[PDB]
Write a protein that binds this ligand. Structure first.
Ligand code: NI
Ligand code: NI
Ligand code: NI
Ligand code: NI
Ligand SMILES: [O-]
Ligand SMILES: [O-]
Lengths: 100, 570, 122, 570, 100, 100
């Protein structure tokens, strides 16, 4: 596979996202690390799908709403950042105020 | 020109009269004073103040009143106060708390806090800064325990152990000269301050004393080695001579004596009473009465902290399975029931709140959680505010009195008890620069940056392959202070005066800073900051109900805590 | 032929503990209000002051129970226990500081026990 | 009073006559004798025996017959016996096997096994304790290989390599003074004992000899460097002078000679024959005949161990792809077919069982599995019991004879072959305290605790953030023996007498314990414990069928093994 | 996310449990580490759901039965322990003899 | 669980395979590390199922075809190797030219 350090690390984000999605599917309000993991993994998968940085900047604000998460979590998350390999190389995505 | 207080707080961190919520608790700390000069605040970045000719002095060499490091705009939470200041570090020590910058052009600059060519900057605006936690009940069982402790803002581990040997799994003991030498060597690679306790057991002086000479920083008396009158007596005689502290886990079984017998053996000498409530160990059921005496420095361990709905079931089962007790053996059941008591655990919450138990500690990996000393201190303060109300002493609707009482339990008080408060345990000028930055939203939960000896040792930080340091995954990571030889300069091995005089460091080739243990034997309860109360604690032998000043101390367990499911992935 | 990994097949028979040592039964009462549990290998005369029994009968002896087990006395409980003889050099040091030498010094042990209020010095 | 034998075994571990199943194999070991005094067993914990005045002596200083560490109630499995004893360690060495405790009050205490103030305790009741494994066929290719080896109870790695260079990927060789110096330095950071082999190739003495002087502990002759008569001859002449061992991987191709030519070059001198069966390398097809000779110390490598249904397909393919051989090139196919042979692999199982191959080894990362030497030894013993029955020599329905024969293959015999059995390779008084504790259910699969020089180096242990050490995830982890400078005191770098005399340690600044290689040149097959058989091995050049004493040695491959899918997550 | 050491480690238990559940779904008798992973992850998810220590002590004895696992696995597992963040903080769960 | 180093490492392969399978399920042509992860995990699960080395040598050539992967990926993968615990212990599987 030739995994570099970041590829090994970012596997953890996907796994945390899978865990959080299962928790949401059984009806839990998600906590801070859960919410972060979901939106982060969403960005990284979006880059893999070939979306643009602008698209992911928009979409990332609509992955979770305040009724998906516990009290205070929306206000704890000011922005979520992820770097992934887009078709045109690694780029940084910042999603500002992902949960209103 | 004027700035509204909301914008000011957002740019520079809060100022006098402003309050900040501690994580997701109901606890509010208020800025008592601020060392700044409004308009001359220090800050670093593009077009910011700490630039040459401006807030950075371009004239002075490092020796000339210039800092190695300025933390700008810190909200300090310390036994000494809750207040706004710049913190100046040099040679790995806090040299200045006040106002940093450039006297060329700024008013109110503390004279030894010049930002010069040699100065690094850490922005603490919007952060709470505390002393590193001092954990005095550490079992050295699993080296992975160190990062766990760093991530919750602990910077000093005192205790004992050789790894997951049964002796070490039960007791905070590194036994004998050879094991102590081996663990002193091991310590060279642990990115945290360390002090090692020898075995506080024997009936001749020489076997105990040779552990102090070998490099131990103190002694532990543990029932599993025989917490007999003789072991207690010899340990304390050694401690009085060597100027080190003795911790005790007393004879739960009451085999050779009851509490009064242990107190008689102690004979008015100073001692640190571990997990004084007694779930973690000691004379059944009345050990917690220790915490009323003037010669006792009392600590709790963390799993009883605070009293919750899961506490009793968790503890009964824990005790039974960890001592291989059977549920069908009445003596086993009787023992468990005599040791795990809602009456004493509930009272323990209140004794903390009243300043009668002075200290928190983990009991890491033996019956406590290495990374939850700080966490549970605040959960306890929060529960007490909910159930008992603001303390009488409070004013302005702040929780400052309670916050100082509680922060003291894991910072200054353990440092005083151990004889190391000349080096560590508080944010004061002249002490080692062990500093923890916290985002208020994560306060007491997950440290932002842990500074050891003036260099960051541990940080919550993201993708090392990214353009900037914040992209995911943000996790706890060792920083440069832990790497190569810098691990030697950023951490202290605490040792007895006699081992230091005898040249043990040079003999073992220790490269770490060597701290002297001292002034352990003529302190008492009265020396515990904000937690100095002595009183007659009565524990009813039949009902286990705890009384102080004629009043039963009882409270309800809570179903939920702050600093819990909002934060933790598991 | 069901396999339990690492299982024992112990041989037949029984293990006699403390074989060939003199045994002695005595009555012991916890006069205290808190429980007292006594381990197999504590010099019996040096147990908690509040246990009342003939202190002389505990000299040079310990409970005749399996190594690492303990006898429990609830508050107020009186029961019989069986003692066996200490072995080795038959010396005791420390614990409650009643012996600090040969267990043969009965007179001196009892005098110390009495002075310190160990119940049952007769 | 009497205790039934089931309860006794559960409390103290098994005693005389009791049997224990090794993992999920059909192999039973029986306690041959027990050093205890029934009723005075040592044990540690609340209300237990090793307490001051009781089973712990409170009088004596460490020097006075007191241990640094007591393993209580060990079931020892060693070439020297299968028996119950306390094991006493001091200064990092086994000083006492017998009965530990306090002579004040206990009968039968071994005089130098006093539990005193200086003594740490490890409970070995219910555990099997063996010597650490000695792996003498290690390629140093990937440092991650070390934990792999520790997790399966290996404590000494002998071999060579500079990391994943082609030379090192093929051969156990650290070539020349400079590479050997570099790897000696590297060794300072590897938490395992190490000895390094130089290149056993050259036609002048000086190029070979300068590697021994530089710090090599032995030599490897490998066909990939030219396993010619000259290289064999010079290596052995160097080895005879320097008192170190030579390992050989002979000329598979028969290019300069057949087996008889290699034997002529050796000329009766002592040599270690690696992967003597020949799948791992050597004169096609008759190399395994080496194992009949008195001057040959024969080892197998582990992938042929034991013969299974997947073995041949796995090996043919492995050979072909690792030598870039094509399936459409008849010379390639012929070579593969001449090298990978069911007839010799099947016979290898039986030669192990008969004590004709003396040693096991990994061939880690070149054609063997770093963490499966111990594992496959027992799978082989199990297969042989199934197919050949209890050996004649057995009694009481135990497998003790077979268990001693087999444990010898990875403990004492490699140590003897290498010239290091004065330090390591068995649980005997006066040897280094490299000890592996095993839960019987996990025996030979996953070590519980690995003790290196008297300190735990590696343990299967759980959540470092937990109240106790057992909560999930339980995984293999480095312990305190590996951390800081303690890694120097807990591990041995084995070196030639000449390098030691020449001050190589001081020259390179090595801080590890330095072990001397010696007594390598006047041993033979007869010196291999429980595995001392010499005989004429015939290998039919046409059919590859192996005969000993006129009888064909053949057995079936098995479809299933114990110590496999019940245990492993992958 | 601010993962602490234990949060990073315990992701592994969830992953091992997912792997084991897939193996059980295709009809395999589970081995020792598989069984342990399943029951451990069950406890940690139960705490996340807000169950009590007493509930998980009961439930953990009924996640796998002896016909779910290979011969000898029930007897190899004396108890499984896990610490997780309950609504009232970290607590220890010990499930005794999880598979009869 | 008593995870050894390899058991901890090989969890990563399973996770990478799960990630890659999700990417294939939403219609992406898989890249080099994705393809490798899928086939590797397939081999390890095959060993767990009790298949032979010979079976996995055959099957591994039919897990992904060239239309499952991006241009050049078939030619980048000369062979994929994995070691797993078969019923008869650890064995090495080499799949040669897995994608034609
Ligand atoms: Ni304790
Ligand atoms: Ni403790
Ligand atoms: Ni070879
Ligand atoms: Ni090799
Ligand atoms: O404790
Ligand atoms: O080899």
């Amino acid at each position: 596979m030739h995994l570099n350090p970041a590829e090994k690390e970012k596997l953890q984000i996907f796994l945390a996202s899978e865990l959080a999605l299962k928790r949401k599917a059984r009806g839990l309000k998600l906590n801070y690390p859960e919410a972060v993991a979901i939106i982060t993994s969403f960005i990284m998968e979006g880059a893999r799908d070939g979306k643009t940085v602008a698209m992911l900047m928009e979409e990332g604000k609509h992955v979770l709403t305040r009724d998906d998460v516990m009290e205070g979590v929306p206000e704890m998350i000011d922005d979520i950042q992820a770097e992934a390999t887009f078709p045109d190389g690694t780029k940084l995505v910042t999603v500002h105020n992902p949960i209103s | 020109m004027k700035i509204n207080r909301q914008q000011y707080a957002e740019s520079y961190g809060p100022t006098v009269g402003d309050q900040v919520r501690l994580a997701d608790t109901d606890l509010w700390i208020e800025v008592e004073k601020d060392y700044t000069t409004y308009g001359d605040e220090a800050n670093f970045g593009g077009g910011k103040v700490l630039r040459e000719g401006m807030g950075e002095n371009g004239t002075y060499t490092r020796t000339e009143n210039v800092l190695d490091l300025l933390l700008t705009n810190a909200l300090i939470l310390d036994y000494t106060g809750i207040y706004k200041a710049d913190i100046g570090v040099k040679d790995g020590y806090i040299v200045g708390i006040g106002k940093g910058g450039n006297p060329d052009i700024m008013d109110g600059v503390t004279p030894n806090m010049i930002v010069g060519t040699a100065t690094e900057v850490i922005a603490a605006e919007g952060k709470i800064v505390t002393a590193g936690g001092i954990d005095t009940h550490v079992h050295f069982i699993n080296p992975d325990q160190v990062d766990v402790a760093l991530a919750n803002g602990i910077t000093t581990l005192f205790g004992g152990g050789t790894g997951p040997a049964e002796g070490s799994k039960a007791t905070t003991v590194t036994p004998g000269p050879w094991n102590i030498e081996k663990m002193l060597k091991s310590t060279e690679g642990l990115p945290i301050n360390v002090g090692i306790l020898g075995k506080g057991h024997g009936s001749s002086i020489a076997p105990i004393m040779e552990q102090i000479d070998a490099g131990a920083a103190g002694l532990k008396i543990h029932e599993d080695w025989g917490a007999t009158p003789a072991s207690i007596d010899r340990s304390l005689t050694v401690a009085d001579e060597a100027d080190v502290q003795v911790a005790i886990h007393s004879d739960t079984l009451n085999e050779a004596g009851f509490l009064e017998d242990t107190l008689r053996a102690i004979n008015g000498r100073v001692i640190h009473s571990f997990h004084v409530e007694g779930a973690g160990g000691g004379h059944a059921p009345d050990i917690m009465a220790m915490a009323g005496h003037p010669n006792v420095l009392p600590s709790s361990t963390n799993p009883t902290r605070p009293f919750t709905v899961n506490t009793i079931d968790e503890h009964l089962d824990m005790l039974m399975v960890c001592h291989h007790l059977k549920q069908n053996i009445p003596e086993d059941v009787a023992f468990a029931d005599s040791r795990i008591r809602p009456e004493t655990i509930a009272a323990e919450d209140i004794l903390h709140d009243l300043g009668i138990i002075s200290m928190m500690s983990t009991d890491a990996l033996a019956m406590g959680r290495a990374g939850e000393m700080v966490l549970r201190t605040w959960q306890t303060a929060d529960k007490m505010k909910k159930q008992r109300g603001p303390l009488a002493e409070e004013k302005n609707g702040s929780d400052n009195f309670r916050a100082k009482r509680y922060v003291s339990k894991y910072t200054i008080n353990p440092a005083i008890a151990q004889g190391i408060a000349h080096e560590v345990g508080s944010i004061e000028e002249g002490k080692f620069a062990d500093l923890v930055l916290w985002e208020p939203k994560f306060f007491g939960v997950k440290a932002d940056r842990v500074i050891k000896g003036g260099i960051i040792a541990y940080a919550q930080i993201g993708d090392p392959s990214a353009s900037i340091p914040t992209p995911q995954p943000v996790m706890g990571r060792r920083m440069y202070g832990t790497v190569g030889d810098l691990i030697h300069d950023t951490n202290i091995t605490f040792m007895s005066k006699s081992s230091i005089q005898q040249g043990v460091p040079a003999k073992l080739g220790l490269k770490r800073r060597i701290g002297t243990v001292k002034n352990c034997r003529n302190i008492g309860k009265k020396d515990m900051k904000w937690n100095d109360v002595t009183t007659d604690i009565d524990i009813n032998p039949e009902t286990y109900e705890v009384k102080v000043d004629g009043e039963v101390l009882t409270c309800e367990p809570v179903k939920e805590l702050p600093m819990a499911q909002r934060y933790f992935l598991f | 032929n069901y396999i339990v990994p690492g299982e024992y097949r112990v041989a037949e028979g029984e293990i006699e503990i403390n074989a060939g040592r003199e045994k002695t039964t005595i009555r012991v009462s916890n006069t205290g209000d808190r429980p007292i549990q006594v381990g197999s290998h504590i010099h019996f005369v040096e147990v908690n002051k509040e246990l009342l029994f003939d202190r002389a009968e505990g000299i040079g002896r310990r409970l005749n129970i399996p190594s690492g087990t303990a006898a429990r006395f609830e508050p107020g409980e009186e029961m019989e226990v069986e003692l066996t003889e200490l072995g080795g050099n038959r010396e005791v040091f420390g614990i409650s500081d009643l012996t600090n030498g040969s267990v043969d010094n009965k007179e001196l042990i009892l005098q110390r026990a009495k002075e310190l209020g160990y119940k049952g010095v007769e």
